[PDB]
Structure 1
Amino acid sequence: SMSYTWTGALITPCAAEESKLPINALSNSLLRHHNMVYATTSRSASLRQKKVTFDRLQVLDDHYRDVLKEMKAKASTVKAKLLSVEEACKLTPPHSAKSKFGYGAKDVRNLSSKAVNHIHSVWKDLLEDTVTPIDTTIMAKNEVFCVQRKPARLIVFPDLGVRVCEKMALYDVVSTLPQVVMGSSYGFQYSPGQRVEFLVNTWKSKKNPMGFSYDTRCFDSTVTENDIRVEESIYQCCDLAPEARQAIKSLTERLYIGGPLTNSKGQNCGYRRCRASGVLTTSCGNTLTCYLKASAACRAAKLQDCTMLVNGDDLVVICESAGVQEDAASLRVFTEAMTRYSAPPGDPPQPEYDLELITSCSSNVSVAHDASGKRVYYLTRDPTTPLARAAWETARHTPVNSWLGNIIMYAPTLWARMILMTHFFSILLAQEQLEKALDCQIYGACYSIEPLDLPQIIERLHGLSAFSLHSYSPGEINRVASCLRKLGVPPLRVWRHRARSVRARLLSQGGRAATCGKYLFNWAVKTKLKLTPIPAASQLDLSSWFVAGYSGGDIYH
C-alpha cells in the first residue's frame, strides 16, 4: 500500500514565503555568512512528495505479537478521563489555525457560544459516524536551516473544531499511557538533565555497554493502516468512558488511518494512508509504534539486556555487548527485523562503545565541570541549526521563538550561554522587552515565556550548576568553534566581552533583570560571584513540562 496518492494539484502557500535570510542592523553581529542560511517554502513541496510516497510491505511475526501483548497488558491498567469542552479549549494555542467554520483560536479559548456549539456538533458527528473520512489540510512548512538545501517538510492537520474534539477524547490517554506502557524507555517524561542521567545510568548498568541510534527513513510514511489500528487497540485497553471509546474508534477510522488531502486553496491534493503529522496522537502513536517494532527487533536480533529510549520516531538502544563482531552482526539482524516491520533505516545503524558519540533527538551527552571541579554530564547538540534560526529570528518576528526554546533546553551548553543568551538579552534590553512573554515550543507543546523568568526556569530544569559549567570537552569546543567559522559567527572571545556589557546593562535595572545578569552571565566575569538558590523558583509550576511529547499536537501549556 502506498503512503500517499496525488492528484497533481500543487501544495500551496497561505501567506508570503521567504527563503532568503532577512537582514537588519543586528544580523552581522551574529552571523556574516548570510547565503548559507535559508528557509524551506512550498516551492520544494514536489520534491518532498516524491521522498514520502512509497509502497509499504509488512510481515508480522511472533516477536511482534509478543511485545504487543505485553504493551496491551500494561495499557489495561490505565484509567483515562474525557476532557470537558472547556478543558480542551484551554489547551488550544492562542495562535492556532482558525476553523473553516467562522471561529478561531481565541473564540475557542474564550468559550464563545459559536466555537462551543460547533465543537459540540463535531463531537456529536464523531459519535454518530465512524466511517466518513475527515478532511485535512496539507501545507509545506517554512523551516530555517544551514546549507548542506532540504525540501520543505509537510504538515497534515484537521480543522480546529476537530482538534478540540481530539483533546477531549485523547489528551489524558496520550499524556498518561506511554509511560505506563514503556516505563523508563518513554523519553518525554524526562527533562534534558533527567534524560542524560537516564542514559549515563543505563550505560553504567551494563558490564560492557554498546549503544546505537536508529533512524527510520520518513517514519510517518512507514506507518501503515495496520500500525494505526494496533495503536487504537492499545488505547482501547485503557479503562475509558464508553463515549470516549466511541470517539477514539471514530477518529481512528475517519482521521488517523487516512483521508483526503486539501491544499490552502481548497483543492484535493490526494489521499493519505500513513501517519498524519499534525494530529494529537502523532507523538504518542509514533512512540508506541517505534517502541513496538524496535522491542520485537531486539528479540529477533538476540541483543542482550536491551534498554530502549524512545521519543516518537527517535530511537536509542543500549545493551550488553557480545563483542564487536557479534554486535555489528546483531545490528544487521535488528535492521532486517525493523525493515520487515516496515521501518527501514535512513542511515544504517552503527554500534558505539562511547556514550558521547550516540546522537538521538539531534543531541548527545557530553561532560564539563562545575564550580567545585566535579564532572557533570549534560545534553548538547550541533549548534548550526539553532544559530541559523537565531539569525532568522534576529531580523523577523516568527510564531515560535526557537532561540528561547534552545536556551531553555540547552542552557548548560557553551553555545547557548555564550551566544544565544548574550545576543538575545542585548536585543531585548535595547527594546525594553525583557518582560514581554514569547511563544516557544518544548517537546512539541507551546509555552508563553517571559525572558525575565529564564533564571528560575533553568535552575529548576537543570539546577544551579548550569550557571557555572566550565572546562567543556575538546570535542564539544571543536564542534562549536567549527560551526562559528562555517556561519561566520564572531569567536567566543568577542561573546565574553559582549556578555560583560549585557551583564552590566542588566544588573542596573535591579529586580528580575539583575537576577538574569547575575545568574546567566556569571561565566563572563573574572571573579565569579556566588550563586545561591533563587526564591521564586519552587513557587513556579513546572511539573507538567516533561510529561509527554505533543509534536504536531496543537497543545498550549
Structure 2
Amino acid sequence: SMSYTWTGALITPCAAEESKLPINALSNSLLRHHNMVYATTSRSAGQRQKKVTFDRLQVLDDHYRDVLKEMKAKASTVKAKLLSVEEACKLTPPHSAKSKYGYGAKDVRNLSSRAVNHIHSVWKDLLEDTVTPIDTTIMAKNEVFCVQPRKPARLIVFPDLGVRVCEKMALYDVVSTLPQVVMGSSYGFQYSPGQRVEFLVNTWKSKKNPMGFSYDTRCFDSTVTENDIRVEESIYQCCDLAPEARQAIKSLTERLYIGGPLTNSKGQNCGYRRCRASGVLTTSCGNTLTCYLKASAACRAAKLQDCTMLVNGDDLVVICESAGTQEDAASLRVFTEAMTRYSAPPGDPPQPEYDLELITSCSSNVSVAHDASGKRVYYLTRDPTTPLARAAWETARHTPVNSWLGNIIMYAPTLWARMILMTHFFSILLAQEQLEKALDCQIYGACYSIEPLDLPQIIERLHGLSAFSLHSYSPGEINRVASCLRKLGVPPLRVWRHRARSVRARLLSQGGRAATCGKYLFNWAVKTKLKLTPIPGWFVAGYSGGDIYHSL
C-alpha cells in the first residue's frame, strides 16, 4: 500500500512566504553570513512529496505479537477520563488555525456558543458515524535552516479545529497517561532534560560491558501502515474508558488516523493519505508506541542482552550488554533487518558505540562540564547551527513560536545558549522594555506561554542549580561552537563575554526579577562570582503536531 496517492493539484500556501533571511539593525551583531540562512516554502513541496511517497510491505512475526500482548496487558491497567468541552477548549492555542465553519481559536477559548455548538455537533457525528473519511488540510511548513554541502519543506496534515477539540475530549487523558504505563522508564517525554541525562548516565553504568546505538527510521510517518494504526487503536481500547470515549476513539481511528483525503489551502483535492498524519493529537503517542513495539521486537530477534530502550516519537536509542565488538555489529544487522521487515528501515545504518558521548539522537549528544565545586556534570547539547540561524530570523521578524526561548530552556546548560542566546535576546528585551511580556514557545511539541523573567526558576527546575555555574567545557564542544560561529559569521565567544557584562549590569540596575536574571543567568560573565543559593505538569507527555497549549 502506497503511503500517499496524488492528483496533481499543488500544495498551496495560505499566507505570504519569505525564503530570504530578513535583515534589520540588530542582524549583523548576531550573524554576518546572511546568504547561508533560509526558510522553506511551498515551492519545494513537490520534492518532499516524492520523498514521502512509497510502498509499504510488512512482515509480522511472533516477537512482534509477544511484545504487543505485553503492551496491551499494561494498557489494561489505565483508566482515562473524557474531557469536557470547556476543558478541551482551554487546551487550544490562541493562534490555532481557525475553523472553516466561521469561528477561530479565540472563539473556542472564550466558549462562544457558535464554537461550542459546532463542537457538540462534530462530537455527535463522531458517535453516530464510524465510516466517513474526515477531511484534512495539507500545508508546507515554513522552517529556517542553514545551507549544507537546501532541504525541501516538511508537510503538516491536520483536520478542522472542531475535530481537534473533539480529539482532546476523547484522547487527551489517554495520550497523557498511557505511554508511561505501557513503556515505563523507556518513555522519553516523562523526563526533564536533567532527569534525562541522569537516566542515560545511570543506564550506561548499569551494564557491565555497555554498548549503545541510535536508530533513525527513514521518513517515519510514511512508514506507519493501516496495521500499525489499528494496533495502536487496540492498545487505547484496553483502557478503562467512558463509552462515548470508546466510540469516539474507534470513529477517529477509522475516519481520521488510518487515512483520508487531502485538501490544499485553496480548497482543492491533493490526493489521499494511508499513513500517519503529522498534525493530529495521537501523532506523538502513536509514533512512540509503534517505534517501541517494533524496536522491542527487533531487540529480541537480534538477541541483544539486557536492553534498555529510550523512545520519544520516532527517535530511538538502545543501551545494552556488549557481546563483543564483532558480535555487536552482527546483531545490529539483524536488528535492522527485523525493523525493515516491520516497515521501518533506517536512514543511515546504525552503529554500535562504546562511549555514551559518541551517540547522537534527536540531534543531541551527551557531554561533560564542571560546576562551581569542580565536580563533573553531564548535560545534553547539539550543533548550534540551526538554533543560531533561527535566532537570526527571529531577531528581524516576530514569529508564532520563539525558538530562541525554547532553546534557552531546553539547552540552558550549553556554552552557546548561555553565552550567545541569553546575551543577545536579553539585550533586545532590555532595549524594548519587554522583560515581563509573555512569549509563546514549544517544549516537546506543546505550546507554552512564558515570561522571560521566569527563566531562572524554570532553568533551575529542569537542569538544577549547576546550569548557572558550568565551566571547563570539553575541547570538542568548544571547537564545534567556535567552528559554527566562523561558518555563520557570528562574532567569537570573547565578544559575547564582553556583551554579557553589559547585559548583566543593566539587568542588576533594574532590581527585582530582572536583577535575579542578571545574577543567575550571567554569573558566568564576571570574575567576582556571586554565591548562587536556590530561588524561592510540564513533562507528562509529548504532543508534537497535537495543537496543545498551556499557560503559567
* TM over 0.5, shorter chain: yes
Q: Paired residue for 2:353?
A: 352
Alpha-carbon shift at residue 460 of structure 1 (Å): 1.1
Cα offsets for 1:113-166 (capped at 9, x unmatched):
010000000000000000000000000000000111000000000000000000
Q: Paired residue for 1:285?
A: 286
Alpha-carbon shift at residue 362 of structure 1 (Å): 1.2
2:306 aligned counterpart, secondary structure: strand
Cα offsets for 1:192-246 (capped at 9, x unmatched):
1111111000000000100000000000000000000000000000000111000
Between the aligned partners of 1:361 and 1:240, the Cα distance in structure 2 is 33
CA RMSD of aligned residues (A): 0.5
Cα offsets for 1:149-195 (capped at 9, x unmatched):
00000000000000000000000000000000000000000001111
Cα offsets for 1:507-552 (capped at 9, x unmatched):
01100111001110000001111011111xxxxxxxx111100000
2:549 aligned counterpart, secondary structure: coil
Between the aligned partners of 1:236 and 1:479, the Cα distance in structure 2 is 48
Where structure 2 has 5 or more consecutive residues not aligned to the other structure, the ranges are none
Structure 1 segments of 4+ aligned residues over 2 angstroms from their partners = none
Between the aligned partners of 1:428 and 1:269, the Cα distance in structure 2 is 43
Alpha-carbon shift at residue 475 of structure 1 (Å): 1.2
Alpha-carbon shift at residue 393 of structure 1 (Å): 0.3
2:381 aligned counterpart, secondary structure: strand
Cα offsets for 1:61-107 (capped at 9, x unmatched):
00000000000000000000000000000000011000000110011
Count of paired positions? 549
Alpha-carbon shift at residue 478 of structure 1 (Å): 1.1
Alpha-carbon shift at residue 474 of structure 1 (Å): 1.0
2:214 aligned counterpart, secondary structure: strand
Alpha-carbon shift at residue 247 of structure 1 (Å): 0.1
Alpha-carbon shift at residue 361 of structure 1 (Å): 1.3
Q: Paired residue for 2:370?
A: 369
Q: 1:553 aligned to 2:524?
A: no
TM-score for the superposition, normalised by structure 1: 0.98
Between the aligned partners of 2:316 and 2:55, the Cα distance in structure 1 is 23
Cα offsets for 1:6-59 (capped at 9, x unmatched):
000000000000001001110111011111100000000000000000000000
Alpha-carbon shift at residue 462 of structure 1 (Å): 1.1
Q: Paired residue for 1:309?
A: 310
Q: Paired residue for 1:35?
A: 35
Alpha-carbon shift at residue 482 of structure 1 (Å): 1.1
TM-score for the superposition, normalised by structure 2: 0.99
1:237 aligned counterpart, secondary structure: coil
Alpha-carbon shift at residue 364 of structure 1 (Å): 1.2
Cα offsets for 1:258-295 (capped at 9, x unmatched):
00000000000000000000000000000000000000
Q: Paired residue for 1:106?
A: 106
Alpha-carbon shift at residue 463 of structure 1 (Å): 1.3
Alpha-carbon shift at residue 110 of structure 1 (Å): 0.6
Between the aligned partners of 1:436 and 1:140, the Cα distance in structure 2 is 30
Q: 1:411 aligned to 2:404?
A: no
1:139 aligned counterpart, secondary structure: strand
Between the aligned partners of 2:208 and 2:133, the Cα distance in structure 1 is 52
Cα offsets for 1:450-483 (capped at 9, x unmatched):
1011111111111111000010111111111111
Between the aligned partners of 1:145 and 1:192, the Cα distance in structure 2 is 24
Between the aligned partners of 2:322 and 2:30, the Cα distance in structure 1 is 44
